[model samples]
Target chain A: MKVVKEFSVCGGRLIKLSHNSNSTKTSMNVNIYLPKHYYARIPTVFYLSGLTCTPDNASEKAFWQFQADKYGFAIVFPDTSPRGDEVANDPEGSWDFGQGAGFYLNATQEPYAQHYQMYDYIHKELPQTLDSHFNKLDFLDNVAITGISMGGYGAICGYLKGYSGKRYKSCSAFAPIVNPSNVPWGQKAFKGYLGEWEAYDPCLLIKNIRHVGDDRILIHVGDSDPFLEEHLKPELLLEAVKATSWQDYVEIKKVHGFDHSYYFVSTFVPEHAEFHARNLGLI
Target chain B: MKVVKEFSVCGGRLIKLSHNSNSTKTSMNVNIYLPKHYYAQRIPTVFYLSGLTCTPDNASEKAFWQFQADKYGFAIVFPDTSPRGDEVANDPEGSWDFGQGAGFYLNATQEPYAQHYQMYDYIHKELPQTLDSHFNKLDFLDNVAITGISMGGYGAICGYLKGYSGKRYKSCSAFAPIVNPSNVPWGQKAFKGYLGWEAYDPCLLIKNIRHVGDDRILIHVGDSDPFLEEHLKPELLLEAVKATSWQDYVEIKKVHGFDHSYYFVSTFVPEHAEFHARNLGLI
Candidate 1:
């Protein structure tokens, strides 16, 4: 990871990096906030962003630095998708379907299959890449994953999908697309990229994971979010867990008077940070 | 005073507004963050002035003052850098230092800018009065604090010192501000364009300021600031106050390894917010 830019913010350093990815076959951008005592060994948190966002969006707007600093943890924000003129994008130029919206899953369809292997990029490659590069940073082992909107869906999917290995210490999301398999956004991307319903379903993903001791997940969504009825039916997630071993493990809070912007994320970020901190044993 | 957009962030309402400004003869945009108890009773206010090539949104989105306001039980008013519209005159050559984005917080006596460039009157006089008239729940008077970046630094200093009485704002501060406008390129251009450098001299202005109790001003600039020597010479401010009662009155801190960006501003904002809170007797 080449440090493209570095800024000292809130008793820590926000390092922006650009590195070529073998999985995506394109250059990728990532932002890492190394909190005050990062050299003294702090845990990490991966915060995936929503659609049409760069690494800069969440870093600048989400107000996460203070919480990361407060909890003595580092934060890594990866770009939503592989991006470049050479990389194929949505044929319709629509924001939700392509380019910035990588959907955080592997692409099996034509053109996209060549470069949109975001699942491996995020889950398998990026972490190893970062760990090897930083060497001292514990990005892979002791970390929590959280995201917003499309990234929220990615967080839950990533967490549940990797639960078998105990890959993630904990997981949380903000206004996540809980049952993307049944939503318009998921249907479009699932058909265009993955080409099948079986692999990308968070509902199915959660059931397959062996429920470990005292397993739990945290999720929150705004009641006023416009996508609540359509793309972000988080209730479907709860419904899917019914009668399963994970039935009472997921906690979902529907907050009033918040939309799906950073304004909403920032309000709940402090709480999420604390949750992840406790799970990571930072507290 | 008209609410153009509002977002609930950090238990406060960041209301983006557009109102007819009789001072500037244009519709002005401002952002006011009403903290939790704003309607219960009047709270002290802080007015944040933005720098060159910025609108009300830049600071509103990045400064993280909303957290400070919520923490300290004070309201924050982010005013536009200058009056904007097609009718408003821009610089003759489209330079960012003058017209539209750079009002220098001083009224322009030079033609085509004369009518619509009354930023000093708009900011110090009209805007606060307008806000106070409509919002009975925010105390926008003697208990207020004024702070800014770059050109706004000049504005805040000029406003505080000129008020002499210190009865207008209880405290004032700046981040990478243009401390000496009479010498720097951006400041020279603004001074010549706006006319009469005599009335707006920081050196002359601070000298005439009334003691008004144990009043003091706070300022911070990064050592790595590109404009350290030429543009934001905090030394000139200290130089101007030399051998005067104001010498010990102004606290100018030269921070290391920072720049003129909001990264620097947000880093020290907590300290500045705390300083103002103490001055305003919030702590």
Candidate 2:
């Protein structure tokens, strides 16, 4: 990984990196903020951003540096999708699908499958690459995952998929599309990117994944969010877990007067940070 | 004033406003974050002046001040850096430093700029009155604090010291401010392009304005700031205050590994918020 730029943030450095990704077959950009306690192995948090976002969006708006500094953890911000002129884009030229909306899943369709390997790029390749790049931090293991909107869906999906192996110590989301299979945004993305109606759906995945110990998925959604009902049906995740071991393992907090913007994500970041901190043994 | 857009953030609302400015003879945009306290009680205000190439929305979105406002039960006013329009004067060289976005918060005495670059009067006098007449729920006149980043930082300290005798601003702070605008290149270009320098320079202003009882100016600058050596010479303010009544009233905290970005500004916001809150009698 090549350091594109480095910035001194809270008590550490926010390093912007660029590297060739084998999984996506494109040059990918990522940002990682290493806290002040970097002398030893530091727990990391992966922040997946929503649709039409790059690594810079959440890094600039989420206000996570303060929490990372407070909790002595690092934050890795991966790009939403593989990006390049050679990469395949939405055939219809829509923001909700194709390039910016990778859906955090590996594409199986023609043209897109070559570069749309976001599922592996984010959950597997990016972490391993980051671990090799910065050996001082625990990017591969001892990490928590969280996201916003589309990214929130990505985090929960990855957490459950990797649950048996204890991939992520904690997982949380902000205004995520819990049941993407039933939402328009997810349906379009999945139809375009994955043909997946259920393989990557959180609602379906939660039913099969058994609840491990006291582990729980924390979720916060704004009642005022424009996409709450249409694109982000968070209530479906609660319904899907009914009668399963994971029934009470998912907690969704519906906040009033908040929206789908970063304002809502940043306001509740402190609570999510503390939750992850406790799970990561930083407290 | 017209409400362009309003967003629910933290425990308050961020109101984006646009109004025809008599001072600049152009439409000026401003953002005000009224904490949840506004619904319950009246509160003081903090004016966050943004740096070059910025509209009020920059700090309103990235500075993470909404949380601080909610915590301290105070309002935050994000003012435009300079007047903007086709009629407004820009840099003759087509550079950003002396153009529309780099107002430097001074009433220009230079050519075409003199017509629409009356930021000093607008920020200190006009905007407050306009806001007070519009929203009487917040105390915009009496209980107010001021702070900024980079050029706006210079504006904050300069305004605080210039208005010290009248106690116009109860508290003041800056992040990576160009203290000695007369000596720095960015400041010199702006000073020479806009108006005369000494009258508006923070270093000189501190010497002329006598320090009041227990009133202190808080400042934080990053050691790793690219402009630290050339543009933002904060030490000059300390030197200018020596042997004067304001000798020990200014405190500049040189933090390690910080830059001239919102990352730096947002990192120190909590501490600055507490300082302003105490000065504004919110805590």
Candidate 3:
């Protein structure tokens, strides 16, 4: 119920939407950019960003259109957090924990549990809204999720936990804090949102639950990634995937000469889109 | 004293300069991108700005440079008013004044006298900076002056009164804004900067000032100019030149379908440069 005005810019249709989801008593704002092909047919993939970001960030300055244009897919950008003056705002403008950083999981506790329903807004409300408003793009057919940094984590969570029984054909991320609950970044926000619970952990969800999604999961991280040594221990997830015998499927890509920024994401967005397209049969 | 850094960009060496010569306590920032042949010790031409603006507003965005490249002349760009923090902070807010509306004039005397020396910076200091940085292309011959809207007034004044010595820019604006002080946007702003004088006017500057510069002056204007009824009264300045039989030589070129914006300026930049080049004996 949040889709706002729609306009066209540079061959893409921009939709401005806002929805009340976060238990923080806030309404989220999301600006979705769909390429021209979406109107003609259903897009092959969708991108969900991580903490402290919105949909427009990747599409605007990343200059990924050269690749996205070739593949012919649509992009949906959602606001990182809820809106309204009544909604809480972080006093310090750190990269995470407030305005721009929504950890993607829904809340079920006290102060945060009230409105932090990102899980519902994205998995439930968004699909329904897209189907009703923009029926041109077949919402049910082929879909994928990809992101970076904090967004990388959220995108992984949304795709893995979200498409556990759905039709999302593929998923991938760059420098995702693979094991969120164990990572400082995830613990900081998840603790505040869900209130100290192992049940909400992404690593636990992937390891024990062994929820096989519609397609394999792919991820990449820098060898010198600050979080790899501490917050993100890929070995734990790798060991879990190995035990589940999903080694042939789950893929994790890593590079060295890069920092944790869009410079890295934009550089690899082309191959990421290619990965999803091939899996989703869009190619 | 505003001229600062200068470098090459997109075939032109741009200069970033500032000065304290506007009648207000606010200084202006400008990015003047000069054309290519400017470095070979060739005579140069400059573009003046209107009020409440910056150099990027025209030179970078709107002023079409395609024709200027074709015409082959050295060009320069100076921004609007100064961006002085304390003195010119948005005219006590709620108003565009004290910020974006410099009107490109030197202040004779005003409450904010210390800061309003921009006109002197652009016309006087800017010339020397451009000259010293990129030797006199006139091969020590002549220079060119060009602008429109409120900036055209600056061009006219600099051409007619300020540097009537003709030593700086010889050829004048093709779409010259003849009468800005007496009648145009920012009449009060102009009067305030021109120093407590209303009718002392642009006509006075045109009539008796050194009617001769190093090169002849070329004036161009559209008959249907939206500012025709009030602001851009080219006939007033032309009448003064005719009444005095000044040797400055005023000619009017007509244009259609273009407003006073850079769209019109860019359309005529090549011709303007060529006009000035001929004055400098550039073939």
Candidate 4:
């Protein structure tokens, strides 16, 4: 059951719901804000939060819905991972490693075999939930997703991997760890959740992935991110784009004097939203 | 003098300051986020925190500066009351009453007296300190402000009554309070503070109150609010305005199912910022 808390602001029902989907047949936790316009119009963008974050990080803090409310778009925030007291947690209990960091991928290894299904939760079940409750939406019309840091990586990688064109008409990532399989974060998560599996490689997931239809892609990265040299590899990702001769649909904006944070993400959120709205045909 | 606290987030500096004013001379705690934008341009808009809140609310929760960096605005969040140390706190049930509130007004003859000078410090000393340290502010554009409930009432009502008016340019009220003195006549004026007997009569203040070069005013109140009867006599204030033909410059939106608290405030913060932005001709 979704543990719900509701309040009213700007002529809409604002709700904070706590739930874990990884432990059940499918587990997910999310936070959502229904703007004064959502009930009356279809939204052109959706924002997903990252590691150690539920929808609360973006919902209560950044409150993107303000502009979205004016632009008339829906924002859906889901949990980073499945959570509950009865569930098995990461061995380290680290906020970055376990319960709250689902990495937006379905797991297939031993210890985490049965439940960790963030990929399916976000791409599949979550969309169904959106359609049923948030008006019967056509992914082509109004719905874009964006995020920051690890969530940013998920945003970029997920956009590149385009969930079968079943959801998201536009997408962007801010200071994301673009090429993850080679990074410590991916290696660690992969090792822990998928056991030394090679087929479940993130690089391949992003490199070979493609959506069946037209969807715009945008990316903003900070040059000074500590992880830039090791994990981000944004430059290399760009080079790989040229080498692979993939569709040139992604827009990458590199900024200076910024790091992997809200400082960086907030700078680009409005532009990203506007871009998505333009592509989603909401503006 | 402004005392500073420099912490890091989003790869930039997040500073919190405490300053004492000369006009009111009360200490105010402020939180600021300095992104790369502050390095190049002047801030355009900002929102103020509610009553009974400290610098932490805007610091930890209201993650606006990052967006402000992109939106081209500055936010200066001040603490609600004086420092509580060896000698203070609220009454029994910790009801949203005295102690922490400071009512956003300077101290006077109100029965319960404290050394805190919040209200005056907010617009006077605290605000100037904000301009000096944060805004590379050019004296050309209108500034933005927003507050709710008691603080909202105080922001608007006090702005109307403030003896000085160099600060606030565009302002708005969220689920605001129009008059408290009428309902709580026992304290607003009778209580101890700088307001003294001058404010005990809203009518007198209304008659004498001067313009602060206002750009726009946005006021909100829930018709169903419990305070709608006595504490939030919004229409009563508007009724008086009608006689004077004074309703053209402001936009008052009444949200349904809302009340006087953070839940209501958080719901509409983004719009509040934009309201000022729209009024100031920023968007």
DockQ (Cα-based) for each candidate? 0.71, 0.74, 0.05, 0.30
Question: Model 4: per-residue lDDT, tens digit, B1-283?
Answer: 4646454444345666766544334454656555545555245434354554443444334435444433544444434444443343344455454445545445433434434444555554456555565455433135545444554454555554443245444555544664545445323432434344445333345445454354434667665566566555655555544444244544567777886655566555556656656654667
The model with the greater lDDT, 2 or 4, is 2
Across A115-216, the per-residue lDDT of candidate 2 in tens digits comes to: 999999998799999988877788877999999999999999999999999999899999998888788988888787766367798888877777879999
Chain B global fold similarity (TM-score) for predicted model 3 against the true chain B: 0.73
TM-score of each: 0.97, 0.95, 0.55, 0.74
TM-score of the second chain in each model?
0.96, 0.97, 0.73, 0.70
**Candidate 2 docking category?**
medium
- The chain A TM-scores for the candidates, taken one by one, are 0.97, 0.98, 0.85, 0.84
lDDT of 3 by residue, B1-283 (tens): 5557543333445556655433334455656655656544454555555534544444444444423532565555555554445544344444543333543445445554434444545545554454455442433224555554445454455444555654555545646464645556555555554455432465666565655434455666655466666766766666777756564466666554345644355445556666655765566
The sequence of per-residue lDDT tens digits that candidate 3 reaches over residues A1-283 is 4666554433445567765543335555666666656545556455666665666665443433434456777666666666556555555656677566667767665555555676676666776666776666656667777777666666767666655476566788887776776778778777677775454555666765455534577777767555678866665666666766465566777675444555456556667878877876677
| Best-first order by DockQ | 2, 1, 4, 3
Q: Least lDDT summed over 10 consecutive residues: which range in candidate 3 chain A?
A: A59-68
Identify the superior model by lDDT, candidate 1 or candidate 2: 2
Query: Which 10-residue window of candidate 2 chain B scores lowest in summed lDDT?
Result: B203-212
Off-target runs (Cα >4 Å) in candidate 2 are none
Which runs in model 3 stand beyond 4 Å of their true positions? A19-26, A38-40, A54-59, A63-69, A88-95, A162-166, A197-200, A208-267, B1-283
Evaluate residue B185 in candidate 2 and report its C-alpha lDDT on the 0 to 100 scale. 93
Residue A144 of model 2 has an lDDT of 95
